[PDB]
Amino acid sequence: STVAISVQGLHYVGTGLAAIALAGVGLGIGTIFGNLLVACARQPNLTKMLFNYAILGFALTEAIGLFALMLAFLMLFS
Amino acid sequence: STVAISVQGLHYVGTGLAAIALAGVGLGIGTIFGNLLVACARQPNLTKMLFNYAILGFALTEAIGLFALMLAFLMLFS
Amino acid sequence: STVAISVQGLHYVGTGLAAIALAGVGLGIGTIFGNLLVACARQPNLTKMLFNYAILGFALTEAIGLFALMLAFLMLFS
Amino acid sequence: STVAISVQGLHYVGTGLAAIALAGVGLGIGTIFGNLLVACARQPNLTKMLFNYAILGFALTEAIGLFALMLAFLMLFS
Amino acid sequence: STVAISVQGLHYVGTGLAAIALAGVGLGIGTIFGNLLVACARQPNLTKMLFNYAILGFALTEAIGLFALMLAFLMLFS
Amino acid sequence: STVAISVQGLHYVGTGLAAIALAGVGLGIGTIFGNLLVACARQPNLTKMLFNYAILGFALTEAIGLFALMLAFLMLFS
Amino acid sequence: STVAISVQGLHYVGTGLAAIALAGVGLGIGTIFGNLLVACARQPNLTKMLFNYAILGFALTEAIGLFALMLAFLMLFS
Amino acid sequence: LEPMSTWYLASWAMVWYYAFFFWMPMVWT
Amino acid sequence: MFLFFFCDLFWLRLLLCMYYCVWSRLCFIVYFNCLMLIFDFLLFCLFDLYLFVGLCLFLLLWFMLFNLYSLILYYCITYLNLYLLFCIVFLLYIAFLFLFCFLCDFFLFNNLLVGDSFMDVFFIRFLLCFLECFSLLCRCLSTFLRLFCNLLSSHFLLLMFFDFFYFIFVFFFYGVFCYWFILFIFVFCFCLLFYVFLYLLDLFAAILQLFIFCNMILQLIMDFLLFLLFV
Amino acid sequence: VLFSTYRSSRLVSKEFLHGPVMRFRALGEYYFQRAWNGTLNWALPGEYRLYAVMIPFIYFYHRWHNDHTLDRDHVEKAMIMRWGGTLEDVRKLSAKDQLRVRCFTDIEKLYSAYGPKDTYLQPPGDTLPGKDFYR
Amino acid sequence: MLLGGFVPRRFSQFNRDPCWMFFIFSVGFWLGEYPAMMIKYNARDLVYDPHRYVWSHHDDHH
Amino acid sequence: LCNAASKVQARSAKKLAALTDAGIQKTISEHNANGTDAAVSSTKRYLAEQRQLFHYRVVRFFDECHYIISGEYFAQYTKVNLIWDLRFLTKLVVLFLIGTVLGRQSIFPPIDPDSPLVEALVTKVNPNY
Amino acid sequence: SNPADHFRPNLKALTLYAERQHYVDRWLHVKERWLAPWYLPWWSPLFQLGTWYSQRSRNLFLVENHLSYRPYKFRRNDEDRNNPY
């Protein structure tokens, strides 16, 4: 027989899964800054260019994480 | 007996799983920039040639993320 | 047939999944500090720049940690 | 008693799992480019040769992603 | 009481999990093609021998990839 | 009340999980060949003995893969 | 009301999970051999003492994999 | 969550638009 | 529907009027990089590269009057809505983007086609160009989303911790007089330490997020600036 | 010709309200116009006393507003819903009863998510009125 | 920016400046409102509302 | 258990020696030489002085009452007196509230038998309290 | 829930409602009154700015032929996904 079911609570589980994508974002940010300190330790005079590129990398990485948040909030309110 | 069941909330769970793909993309981008920082500190004179290849990497890695997002949007709105 | 189901305890499951994101955050902090010690070892004089950049990044990784924690509380207290 | 059940929302879950394979692909690509920058910063005169090999690696890891994408599509439309 | 149940959609779930095996396989290839660039820069005279070994490693990793791919397809069309 | 249930489709799920272990094997292969190239560049004179040891590493790592694969196939047909 | 339920196919799921434990075991063995090649390249005269220690590490790592494998087979036959 | 709401978004944004068009000149001068 | 409400800055407006009726020097600026775009001398730009200074300063002042003072209990961030922040970032980002586009210099976009002639135009360079043109809008969205969510999450955490602290302080202080007073003292010291840590973290992050909100816009501007050399 | 666009077109005399304005400026300048009062983007001054004075005042007036205008709505809603669902029904009670109810509401607020759940979950077998008491 | 200003060395000096006098009064209010809440909300004669199960915010927002 | 006691004693000794009050140091030295307790002696001296100053307090009270009633106090009224009076009023109010609470021996007003809250009294978890 | 309720504006004073038809009609009357006088020719840029875009939008609306149903903009209840009416 055909049965159609609509569970309210399944919109929570999907949301939590999307948050896990943040784990690959936080680590990625830590990797950039970890390399920044070494790069500054190796070519300290060049701190500015390294710092700017670190911000650029941080910005791009955060953008990806937010897309996960966009889905997380879309499902949480759906 | 034959029983066909259609759980709506399941389309949320699949979406959350796809978002996890962003964890690899986010980490991969940070790894590229992490190498870029040290790469420039080694040879600051090449802060242009190296930069071109880095953003090439960001675009190639972000391309995979589009598929992950596309699947999420192709299942969240389905 | 139309069936509407409302599962109560599912919100707990989503809460735990979001907490997993902190695994990629706490590790990310360790990576930054791990690089900090090495950088300070080979550039003791330039400890000021390295320590400041470590704490700046720690806040840009803690943000992502706060991102997940908010969703956890939303799915735990609502 | 014999009971046969056909859940038509499970194909969503399988699709999301396949997308997780992309996490190991996008990250792999970033690793190649990360080492490329270091390789270029060491022997820039060999960049034209290293870049071709870097593209070759991307052509293989991306091919693996297609297989995961194929499954993500077959189940998402079947 | 004896109850026999046959869930049909579960064959999709097993297919998705096997696809995750490719995550390590794709990442493993990136490692080979990552170290290859570093090795080539140090010893550009040995590009041919290193390139052959890299192909050897890629073939070995791809073998496991097909093993997982075989399981995924078998559980998909079964 | 006593209820005994026999789900036929669960064997698919267990099979997929056993395939995931292949990722830990496939990635391990890349690591051995990732460092083999570096060792060859470092000490080209030992291109033979290192290659034999790398093959041994593949054998031991591959043997673990087959042990996991045996469980994957046993549950697929039982 | 008191209800006792006995699900049969669950042992397949538990067994598959134990198989994943071999992922780290396979990766760990590959790591040992990878470092072995570099160590041999660095100190080519110590091609036997290093080999003996690598075997010892593999034996210990294999024992951990065997511990998990015992549970994997035991549950599969319970 | 009101922060995620849109049933009175226009009136809510009027605060920012007033700040930008009418208070920024005063703070400027 | 027309809703009439008021911002939560009236006291701060009064203080600004009282304290700034007379001139005073400003030397500490949250985002100082908007005043020094060129670091190599003899480089000059014909584009109005210093147009962003006034907006940057006003935005810093406004967001500081709101966010920093929001730590005080019961203080309200009147503008805290996702779509309102979207409107703000849209205004700024799209205004600068349309300033660059109205210049009617198509060559300015040549750098969008990433890479060199040696890469396939249709299958490599063009795809990357599409991805980068997408990345611009993604940068706008990311700026606004980050600004919204940092505040929301931090204040949620602060409210939860304060609720826990109130609960334990009110309903378990009697343990000071009991034999298990040591456990309560340890918990109270832990709570005080966490309270201080949270306040410091929020104070630093509020200012860092404004640094980054203005830095994204300045980066957008810099991505299309060309400097001539004096001769 | 009708209105001047220049600020120099004065509308009042230079000495209009000179005394009060000078007192106001004296109040403004005594603490702010100092070397150590170096503001950060005009928002965060350097004078410690400014923080010490303004933080308590801001908290006080915000808390007064919240207690007497915002939380009062929730308290009144609870009183109405739990004691008849109409304002007249609540007013039928004495001031002491209303005090008891409002203090119980404060108890619930303080408990929140860490307090015992019997304050809103009726244990089985409890003799107290249920949700359908007034229905 | 926290550059300067009067800084009392200890509690006894908080009366040496009007601003710090107001500050210590505010701190007294802050810290003394807690014991008052302890006494008021843990009193023996405090009684839970009999109709507390008639309605609750949990059912309303749910 | 012993090292901590020694450390506390040493810290107290250091602080006691740190103070530069001639009278306090002189009293401490005298009591140490005599082996007596300075703090207890100070307490007894204060109690004796208060016992001998009771009627002085009464006379001062009457003098202050005359000063206030005569209107001379308000003739020289200043802002400082206003601050003191506000403090005095606050203490009066808080004392009145505390006195009411103690008088009825309950933080909250007692519940009348006709009130609908009597059920709460009936449903006490622990009737003893 | 309760923590979420703390993020609302705290100085709401008044709310006014007005149907789109009513104030649109009033605006049209104002525009007609100000664009009617003879000393503003129809070919002037101001008159065209006032009228042409509105005419174009209304014409686009009239020509619309959509196979799907667009629920009324100002229904009493629009929170139900399974009831467009």
Next chain:
Amino acid sequence: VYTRWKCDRLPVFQLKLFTQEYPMHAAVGIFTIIFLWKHMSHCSEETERKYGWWAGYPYWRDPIARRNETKYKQMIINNDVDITHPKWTGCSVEQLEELSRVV
């Protein structure tokens, strides 16, 4: 010497600032305001009941019903609307009288 900020009055300086200093920003702001008031300026009754009240909708007095009642009464009285017309009721006046006598 002449300077816009020091010599011009506030309205004039505002116009100059948003016409010859930040004209694109003002244009985009007006565009966004128009969009917001064209597509985000409506709230249904159900939406107001769900989220439009601080502590919740007081169903025990239904203020929305009273508001609508006052609106409709004012409209009817001012515009002289005959609510008994057949279009409003779907039946003739005589049929309405018959129904009234029946019920």
Next chain:
Amino acid sequence: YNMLVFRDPKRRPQLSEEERAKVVVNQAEWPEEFKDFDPDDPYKNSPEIIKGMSSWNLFLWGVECAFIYQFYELVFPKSI
């Protein structure tokens, strides 16, 4: 010293040791407020703003205000 996050500013020395040693200190000319001046407690002798108003008195005043704020309704309750 510090009071929470508020740190007391310290004047940098300007005189060299040689010049400093030749300076003759005469506290008789110093104001009564600053005699036996101690950098670690410069305001020990500073006069009170209000005579007889101690810091503890203000703290107790605040505590009493809090108690009133919390207990006034308990003695003078008002109807809704």
